[PDB]
Enzyme design. Structure first.
Site, PDB file in Angstrom:
ATOM      1  N   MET A 121      -1.388  -6.593  -2.141  1.00 35.28           N
ATOM      2  CA  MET A 121      -1.628  -5.326  -1.439  1.00 35.28           C
ATOM      3  C   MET A 121      -0.490  -4.322  -1.645  1.00 35.28           C
ATOM      4  SD  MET A 121      -4.660  -5.479  -0.163  1.00 35.28           S
ATOM      5  CE  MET A 121      -4.738  -4.215   1.102  1.00 35.28           C
TER       6      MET A 121
ATOM      7  N   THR B 138       0.852  -1.224   0.000  1.00 37.09           N
ATOM      8  CA  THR B 138       0.000   0.000   0.000  1.00 37.09           C
ATOM      9  C   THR B 138       0.870   1.251   0.000  1.00 37.09           C
ATOM     10  OG1 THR B 138      -1.855  -1.069   1.171  1.00 37.09           O
ATOM     11  CG2 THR B 138      -1.737   1.358   1.277  1.00 37.09           C
ATOM     12  N   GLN B 139       0.602   2.153  -0.942  1.00 33.23           N
ATOM     13  CA  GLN B 139       1.273   3.450  -0.989  1.00 33.23           C
ATOM     14  C   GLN B 139       0.253   4.541  -1.306  1.00 33.23           C
ATOM     15  OE1 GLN B 139       0.757   1.626  -3.644  1.00 33.23           O
ATOM     16  NE2 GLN B 139       2.605   1.371  -4.896  1.00 33.23           N
TER      17      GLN B 139
ATOM     18  N   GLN C  54      -5.637   4.986   2.406  1.00 32.30           N
ATOM     19  CA  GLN C  54      -5.445   3.505   2.458  1.00 32.30           C
ATOM     20  C   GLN C  54      -5.919   2.856   1.159  1.00 32.30           C
ATOM     21  OE1 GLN C  54      -3.837   1.626   4.747  1.00 32.30           O
ATOM     22  NE2 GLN C  54      -4.222  -0.148   3.419  1.00 32.30           N
TER      23      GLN C  54
END
Ligand SMILES: [Mg+2]
Ligand SMILES: [Mg+2]
Ligand SMILES: [Mg+2]
Ligand SMILES: [Mg+2]
Ligand SMILES: [Mg+2]
Lengths: 233, 204, 196, 222, 125, 195, 226, 212, 195, 196
Positions: A107, A1-2, D1
């Site tokens: 992810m 995740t970024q 997110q």
């Protein structure tokens, strides 16, 4: 995740009777800052495919290297690398689509929306979409980001269904694309005047146009607009 | 937690040829627990009929409120209130509680006594009017009712045919909803006679 | 938003872009951010459009009632009324206003009122999201007692750069000139200022 | 997110006949309030007289259909070109889905075909693999609009025989392929009217002993 | 300051007369004649435009006023009192009816609301 | 508090209410009467948040007793229940709502009928043959559904009530220290001292 | 929702779609979004449907009283000022987004109003979930000195873009034309490009299909004489 | 959901409802909440539907491997403990399970094990699991005796589900009955709650509150 | 689970453990034996999170039974308790800790002495004359402090235990459905079937 | 931080301030942000000091090992190694690096690597917190093929403005000149550049 840092906005595209057109502006935004003005976001693969990318630029540059590496790899032990066993748009797309979905499933996505435009061996038009989620779809017109909201409606007035494709010439298609790019310049706050356009035709091949500009703009009516309601002067 | 789906229940209304129909289930619950199988959700003030879904305490409170208001209306106006007028009263009454609303889904139904024109209307909890020609739906099985009504409904149905349509629309919708059912009532409304029919349905 | 007000020999000039955005969508590309609170007292608006419009409308009312009783108000007075509203209602306002006006006694004056509600009298003032990118340029290129043509060029070049870098700014460059001669509106289109 | 899931809308419908089965689905693909494509095939012929659709998040839908088609291919290699029976396909899909129990394929899967006795069959899956043979199943966005209609018009629920007054139920007479297709079309017409994510086109795959046949119909494009 | 007149200025006299009301009716008697006639398919109301000066533009002084699209009013007596009553009558037709029922009040009920305002000036402080 | 039951039989209403008063970790009392007489032929039991229950019950009691004196007349159970519902319905949108659920058991002397009303803290009123609040219904309603008849005697009602209490004592985790049972009929209100 | 407003030669035109939704469900397939503030001042709303209806009626009511008080036809700038000051007071909690258009003795006007109380001026505007689809069409075909017939065509084409491409918009096109020195003409269902096709089957049931427990006549009439 | 199982003279009765709900939406009325692990063992569904289907189908595979290796029917104790030990490994991961593993062997007799996704494993005579468990328990507790006949025991289980199906909003559809003997389980049919309710109401005189 | 008590008298250790197994809203069982025999003269009772309790108890049982076979010898209560403590102390810093509290009552055949060990889920061991876990001690310890003597007989210990249980049954809100009592002495382990 | 690299006729010049802050406290007022990864390949560091030092140290190692095997690396190669580290470890790095170098074949080159890990070859580059204030100035005043003296003045004036407005920047202006002639360090003190 970024989170995406340096970003590229809309990529727009459509099919016409003998091929496909794709376009994207030359801007690399850094939030609201219009940081980089000379960014090429249409990346050709061979003489039959153009991959248009929006979203995170660092991830675009990674994808750019993967495609460059793909051409090299295809040439290995391949006497027909520039003939029957050359890379097709469909091969290039499916490869990217695999990578995008794999990365989202770990992810750790490539933060992009991609449009692969090209012409197949048998002369069939190829136009398909893929994004950071690995979601894919095809349509006579395809657009990312703001293009989806503003470009598609205009492009769909030209090619509203499959049967409209043979009736649409390259001049009409290019005109619609250029007009759509103007509309996005009026209304997208993360767009630039300078853009690139690519045509992939089954007869005349790949025509890549750089350093294009939005022209024939309407602004004169602005002089008459005064205040926000009651003000006359 | 969600006030509009604690007690459960549904209302549906339809128009026909020179007639309207309004119907409701009979369930009152505390979420999963069934509490009452006689909780009627349709009321009437003169010839104007009002169905109300949602939070039961508000259903009761609003019924008492519109009885109150239509009674004073009648004394001053020297005539019974009409559906079109009542619809505007319901809207007004709900919107005055804009930032503290009654958690309800009201549905008006009736025939204008002077013009003879069949009328139905629906509202959100805050008073926005939905004046549809065909049908109005409300409650925890509104999606199901929309699906049933859209396919089953055809215009200009005779009273006895309309009864079958609205009944089958309600019943099959309620059977696909956990918080609706436990009996049902259907009102068939004509200009100067009203027939009320309790339907036999599964009691789970 | 990119806005500025600059004093010069004959008076003062207010300058502004015309872009109004809701996120990344340009809601209005021909907005007029130069607004009139009195004959020769205008202001540049930045921040919440609803807030700055509401404030400006109230100020205009106050200066209209002031004029009816006590004659033409000073630019300082107009800035004080702006401040009073912005300061006392700081918890519920997002407004950054530059006030500019022309007296015959005081000549051209510029007052800036940032978020807090403070007042700062300056030779020139810059504000809005796009102003950040031209602090260096404006500091290096501003001179006092410029001519009308020089000040128009200074504003045009400044806002051109602010527009170039700030995505929140764009469209046309509007300007309003305040002198003894009167009130002059100016407009400059993309094809003109982009090539500078 | 980062949110790995999305909603591509769409609505599918499977109905098992006496000696046939249909699996239908609209061809509209969406995100939020935008249309991605007016024709993006959703129901797929997977071979061995099986048809499949995985409605919901299209990336997981495509991933699953791809893996199942692959499973059919390897079933042939490993077991001497044996035909994968619909019940066996159903169990196999359960394991594919449950394989990702703690990061699910965000899809409502339906397959259709014929069982080993030649009768019509439809299986319905949840996102994590719990499955079940059914006679009638709508899935996706407008499932809540379609199912009650099907309970009423396929299974004759709440319908009784005139004159008896609630004493005798309407008999459960068998529906022909022509009769089912009518109910499918009207289900999708109604769903298109009342659900924003439904429209553009309807594609139906009909499965019989003779093979898989396709039928396409236009739907409102608003 | 403050309105320290919180008591009635109209009161019953020994004979049972409400003086201020009688005296108000006397002021109405002095006023210019106005009339109303009801027909089967309509009503007519009329009055004389008693111009206070020939230099005055009597068109600007409206003795006959629209209250609602279907209701009109005319008077006899003190014009200023009429003018404010028309303003109040127009507003009350909206606040206590149209904004509730989404339609204009019937004649009798609007009249009832006007009457109520006039009754209150007969009893309030 | 915890468990409150109600059952309307042929000629009376029976209210059963637990005796326990638990305060966190300890049971402070095992003989608490969770009820108030609103009028000679109307009884109200209650359960909910501490303090609010009694405060609300006594407030209602006073208001009905005031009405009884003013008019020299006993309000019908239906009238009392409607008053109570309004007070709770008023309460739910207040600054700090009464968190109180009630059962109103009364004998209507005009109609010569027993009446049981169930009202929750939101102001949700229902007239029932038998009722409960909280989790009490979950255990007892299946038994009441099975055995209940509208023509039951008071003795038969008490037997069915014992069966409900026994099931509660078996399957409920909490020890509610038994129940106080009261009967409301034409002759008024009386307490069954052995249960 | 898709709503647009277009200025032309001798006046202004507004248009709107006719779909109202609750989430993904279509509540009303022929909603009337074009509202009247005064005879020649009309407006179209988006956002919270009750708030748009409520706020136009309130301002419309106060405008009528103001018009009677001043013996003058109502002005668009008055409606604008009253709307914005009301909406600003409630700091966006009244979710009303309006396009206001009309003619008055001052001339023809076109404004947009947002829920927080900000207002804008323009020759062409669009609001709602289909505003981007509509604005694309407006930016592609709008020009100065449009005729009445051109402005109606442009406005309805902009609404169509919304109908087809925006899921929040659909069904029909409502139009209202406000020209100077003329009565405003409200064109309800100006276009009808979304009629439902005839169903494959009739679902009229045989009489007596539904099971009934009890019948009874309801007394809607008053208490009778004798 | 409402599921029950109880031991008696004639073996075990297992009875379940048939409803499946996603929020207020009734997803299915024809769900099978009795897994036929093998011809001698049964399991019930509560909580997670897939978790039940998957792991109890898997349990049947483990039981089959046991009797292939040991040449002997697996005990209900052993079969239950295989499932409980499995879910205990997954404890924390979010498995949802509330099941009765029911069986009849020579060495044990009729045996019921309640197994839980928390790792709980309880032997017992009467168990009720689901959103409508409290309603079923009431009917069971008041009418249960060890010396019930197979006919009366089957009815008690059917009637206890009906009790829950009526009151509990998330239970209903239809009732499935099983009777577990030493020679294996015996299916005793699917019973629609809609038709059953009216039948029971009339014949039994119960549910006087409801108008029929 | 809920309540587990322990008392070491002159010549034996007595463990009392509740019979209730509550699962949310219902009491699923009222005859549950919350104990395992680790060796002929060593008994361990347990209470804590569901599943973990039995899993842990049986795991310990197996390990002690394995040791007993390997060495043909019964470990002392002290040795067993130290082993158990280490397993819990190991557990507390694990990925998912055992949430189990135990009492180990044993008779040391070498020293001819009864021994009671109290160990919580953290691995906190203490040797005591009488002990408890959870809230059980709060009610009972004041009584045990008062009456306890180290030279009590087994019958006197059981009487003091009844007084502890009675106080629990009076003041605890939860119904723990009585207790199963077991005695550990020189002759081994036996259950008091009437209590 | 205010940093920049500018190409010119004879090669390239790197420029930087010397202020390092922990909140509002100046932890080091004489910091050297111009760091050497090879003889004639240097970089300007912005962001996390720990991160940019760690990265630079690793790059220097890589280029030292590269040189041992394959001879002198290109400026492009050095930028690629910087990118590889910054891109692949983007989740755990806060580094904004400008790479500048001098070949004889390619002459002066400048590469900028922002937060994301992307690479951008430019005639000149600006970065750090203070860069925002000089986008306008630098765009207006940059020319290609400037002289050494012109480029020093351009950098000096630019960073002077960045320092003037940015509180996070300040101290001395360090510069490093990269040409065929060699490596020249320059320093300019407050009294010199503030009066510009
Ligand atoms: Mg139901
Ligand atoms: Mg710009
Ligand atoms: Mg649709
Ligand atoms: Mg504000
Ligand atoms: Mg139920």
């Amino acid at each position: 995740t970024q989170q995406p840092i340096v970003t590229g906005t809309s990529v727009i595209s459509m099919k016409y009777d003998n091929g496909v057109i794709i376009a994207a502006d030359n801007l690399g935004s850094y939030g609201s800052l219009l940081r980089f003005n000379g960014v090429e976001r249409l990346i050709p693969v061979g003489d039959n495919t153009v991959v248009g990318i929006s979203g995170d630029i660092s991830d675009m540059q990674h994808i750019e290297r993967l495609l460059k590496d793909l051409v090299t790899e295809n040439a290995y032990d391949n006497p027909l690398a520039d003939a029957e066993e050359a890379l097709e748009p469909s091969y290039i797309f499916e490869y990217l689509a695999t990578v995008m979905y794999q990365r989202r499933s770990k992810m750790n996505p490539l933060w992009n929306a991609i449009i692969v435009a090209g012409v197949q061996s048998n002369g069939d038009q190829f136009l398909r979409y893929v994004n950071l989620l690995g979601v894919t779809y095809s349509s006579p017109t395809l657009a990312t980001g703001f293009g989806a909201h503003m470009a598609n409606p205009l492009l769909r007035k030209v090619v509203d269904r499959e049967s409209d494709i043979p009736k649409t010439t390259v001049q009409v298609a290019e005109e619609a694309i250029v007009n759509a790019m103007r509309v996005l310049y009026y209304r997208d706050a993360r767009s630039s005047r300078n853009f690139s356009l690519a045509i992939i035709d089954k007869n005349t091949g790949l025509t890549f146009k750089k350093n294009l500009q939005v022209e024939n703009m309407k602004w004169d009516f602005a002089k008459d607009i005064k205040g926000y309601g009651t003000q006359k002067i | 937690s969600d006030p509009s789906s604690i007690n459960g229940g549904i209302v549906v209304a339809m128009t026909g040829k020179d007639c309207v129909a309004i119907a409701c289930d009979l369930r009152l619950g505390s979420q999963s627990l069934g509490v009452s199988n006689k909780f009627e959700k349709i009321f009437h003030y003169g010839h104007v009929f009002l169905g109300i879904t949602g939070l039961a305490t508000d259903v009761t409170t609003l019924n008492e409120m519109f009885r109150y208001k239509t009674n004073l209306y009648k004394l001053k106006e020297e005539r019974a209130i009409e559906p079109e007028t009542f619809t505007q009263l319901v809207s007004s009454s709900l919107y005055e509680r804009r930032f503290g609303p009654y958690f309800v889904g009201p549905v008006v139904a009736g025939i204008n006594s002077k013009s003879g024109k069949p009328f139905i209307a629906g509202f959100d909890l805050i008073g926005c009017i939905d004046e549809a020609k065909d049908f109005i739906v409300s409650g925890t099985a509104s999606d199901q009712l929309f699906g049933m009504c859209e396919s089953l409904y055809e215009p200009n149905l005779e009273p006895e045919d309309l009864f079958e349509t609205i009944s089958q629309a309600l019943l099959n919708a309620a059977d696909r909803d956990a918080l609706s059912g436990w009996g049902a009532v259907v009102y068939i409304i004509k200009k100067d006679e009203v027939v009320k029919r309790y339907l036999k349905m599964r009691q789970d | 938003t990119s806005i500025m007000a600059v004093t010069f020999k004959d008076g003062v000039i207010l300058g502004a872009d015309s872009r109004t955005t809701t996120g990344a969508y340009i809601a209005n590309r021909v907005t007029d951010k130069l607004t009139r609170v009195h004959d020769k007292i205008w202001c540049c608006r930045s921040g919440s459009a609803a807030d700055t419009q509401a404030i400006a409308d109230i100020v205009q009312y106050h200066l209209e009632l002031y004029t009816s009783q006590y004659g033409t108000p000073s630019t300082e007075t107009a800035a004080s009324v702006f401040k009073e509203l912005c300061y006392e209602n700081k918890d519920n306002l997002t407004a950054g206003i530059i006030v500019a006006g022309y007296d015959d006694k005081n000549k051209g004056e510029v007052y800036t009122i940032p978020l807090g509600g403070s007042v700062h009298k300056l030779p020139y003032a810059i504000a809005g999201s796009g102003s950040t990118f031209i602090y260096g340029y404006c500091d290096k290129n501003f001179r006092e007692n410029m001519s009308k043509e020089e000040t128009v060029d200074f504003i045009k070049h400044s806002l051109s750069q602010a527009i170039k870098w700030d995505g929140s700014s764009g469209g046309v460059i509007r300007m309003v000139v305040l002198t003894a001669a009167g009130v002059e509106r100016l407009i400059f289109y993309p094809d003109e200022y982009e090539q500078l | 997110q980062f949110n790995p899931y999305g909603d591509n809308g769409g609505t599918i419908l499977g109905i098992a006949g006496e000696d046939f089965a249909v699996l239908a689905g609209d061809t509209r693909n969406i995100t939020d309030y935008s249309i991605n494509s007016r024709y993006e095939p959703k129901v797929f012929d997977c071979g061995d007289n099986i048809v499949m659709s995985a409605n919901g998040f299209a990336a997981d839908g495509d991933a699953l259909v791809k893996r199942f088609k692959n499973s059919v291919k390897w079933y042939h290699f490993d077991h001497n070109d044996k035909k994968l029976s619909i019940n066996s396909a159903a169990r196999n899909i359960q394991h594919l889905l449950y394989g990702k129990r703690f990061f699910p394929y965000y899809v409502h899967t339906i397959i259709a075909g014929l069982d080993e006795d030649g009768k019509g069959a439809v299986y319905s899956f949840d996102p994590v693999g719990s499955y079940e043979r059914e006679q009638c199943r709508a899935g996706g966005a407008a499932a809540s609009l379609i199912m009650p209609f099907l309970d009423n018009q396929v299974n004759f629920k709440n319908q009784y025989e005139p004159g008896t007054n609630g004493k005798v139920k309407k008999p459960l007479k068998y529906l022909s392929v022509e009769e089912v297709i009518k109910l499918v079309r009207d289900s999708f017409t109604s769903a298109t009217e009342r659900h924003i994510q439904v429209g553009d086109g309807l594609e139906i795959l009909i499965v019989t002993k003779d093979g898989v046949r396709k039928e396409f119909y236009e739907l409102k494009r608003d | 300051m403050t309105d320290r007149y919180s008591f009635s200025l109209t009161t019953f006299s020994p004979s049972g007369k409400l003086g201020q009301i009688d005296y108000a009716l006397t002021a109405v008697k002095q006023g210019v004649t106005s009339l109303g006639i009801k027909a089967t398919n309509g009503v007519v109301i009329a009055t004389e435009k008693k111009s206070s000066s020939p230099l005055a533009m009597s068109e600007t002084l409206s003795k006959v006023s629209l209250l609602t699209p279907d209701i009109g009013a005319v008077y006899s007596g003190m014009g200023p009192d009429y003018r404010v009553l028309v303003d109040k009558s127009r507003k009350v037709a909206h606040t206590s009816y149209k904004r509730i029922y989404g339609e204009y009040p019937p004649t009798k009920l609007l009249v009832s609301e006007v009457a109520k305002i006039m009754q209150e000036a007969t009893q309030s402080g | 508090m915890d468990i409150i039951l109600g059952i309307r039989v042929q000629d009376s209403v029976i209210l059963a209410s637990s005796k326990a008063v638990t305060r966190g970790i300890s049971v402070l009392k095992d003989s608490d009467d969770k009820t108030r007489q609103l009028s000679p032929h109307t009884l109200m039991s209650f359960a909910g948040e501490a303090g609010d229950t009694v405060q609300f019950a006594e407030y209602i009691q006073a208001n009905i007793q005031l009405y009884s004196i003013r008019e020299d007349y006993e309000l019908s159970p239906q009238a009392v229940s409607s008053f109570v519902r309004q007070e709770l319905a008023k309460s739910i949108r207040s600054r700090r709502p009464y968190q109180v659920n009630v059962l109103i058991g009364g004998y209507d002397k005009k109609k010569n009928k027993p009446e049981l009303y169930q009202i929750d803290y939101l102001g949700t009123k229902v007239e029932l043959p038998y009722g409960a609040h909280g989790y009490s219904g979950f255990y007892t309603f299946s038994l009441l559904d099975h055995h209940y008849r509208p023509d039951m005697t008071t003795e038969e009602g008490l037997d069915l009530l014992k069966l409900c209490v026994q099931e509660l004592e078996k399957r409920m985790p909490m020890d509610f220290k038994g129940v106080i049972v009261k009967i409301v009929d034409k002759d008024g209100i009386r307490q069954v001292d052995d249960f | 929702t898709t709503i647009v407003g277009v200025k032309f030669n001798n006046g202004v035109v507004i248009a709107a779609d006719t779909r109202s939704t609750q989430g993904p469900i279509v509540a009303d397939k022929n909603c009337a979004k074009l509202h009247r503030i005064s005879p020649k001042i009309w407006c179209a709303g988006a956002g919270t449907a009750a708030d748009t209806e409520a706020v136009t009626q309130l301002i419309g009511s106060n405008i009528e009283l103001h018009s009677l008080y001043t013996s003058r036809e109502p002005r668009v700038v008055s409606a604008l000022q009253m709307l914005k000051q009301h909406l600003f007071k409630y700091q966006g909690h009244i979710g009303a987004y309006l396009i206001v258009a009309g003619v008055d003795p001052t001339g023809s006007h076109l404004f947009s109003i947002h829920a927080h109380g900000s207002t804008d001026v323009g020759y062409y505007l669009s609001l709602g979930s289909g505003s981007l689809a509509a604005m694309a069409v407006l930016e592609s075909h709008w020009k100065q000195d449009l005729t009445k017939e051109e402005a109606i065509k442009l406005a309805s084409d902009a609404i169509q873009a919304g109908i087809w491409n925006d899921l929040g918009s659909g069904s029909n096109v409502d139009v209202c034309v406000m020209e100077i020195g003329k009565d405003a003409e409200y064109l309800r269902n100006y276009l009808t490009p979304n009629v439902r096709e005839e169903k494959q089957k009739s679902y009229k049931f045989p009489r007596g299909t539904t099971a009934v427990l009890k019948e009874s006549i309801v007394n809607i009439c008053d208490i009778q004489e004798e | 959901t409402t599921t029950l199982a109880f031991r008696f003279q004639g073996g075990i009765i297992v009875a379940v409802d048939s409803r499946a709900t996603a929020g207020n939406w009734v997803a299915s009325q024809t769900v099978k909440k009795v897994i036929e692990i093998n011809p001698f063992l049964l399991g019930t569904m509560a909580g997670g539907a897939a978790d039940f289907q998957f792991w109890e189908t898997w349990l049947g595979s483990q039981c089959r491997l046991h009797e292939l290796r040991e040449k002997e029917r697996i005990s209900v104790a052993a079969a239950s403990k295989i499932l409980s030990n499995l879910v205990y490994q997954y404890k924390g991961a979010g498995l949802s399970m509330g099941t009765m593993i029911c069986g009849y062997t020579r060495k044990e007799g009729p045996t019921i094990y309640y197994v839980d996704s928390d790792g709980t494993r309880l032997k017992g005579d009467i168990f009720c699991v689901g959103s409508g468990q409290t309603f079923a328990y009431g009917v069971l507790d008041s009418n249960y005796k060890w010396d019930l006949s197979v006919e009366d025991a089957l009815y008690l289980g059917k009637r206890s589900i009906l009790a829950a199906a009526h009151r509990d909003a998330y239970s209903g559809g239809s009732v499935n009955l099983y009777h577990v003997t030493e020679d294996g389980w015996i299916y005793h049919g699917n019973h629609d709650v809609g038709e059953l309710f009216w039948k029971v109401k009339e014949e039994e005189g119960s549910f006087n509150n409801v108008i029929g």
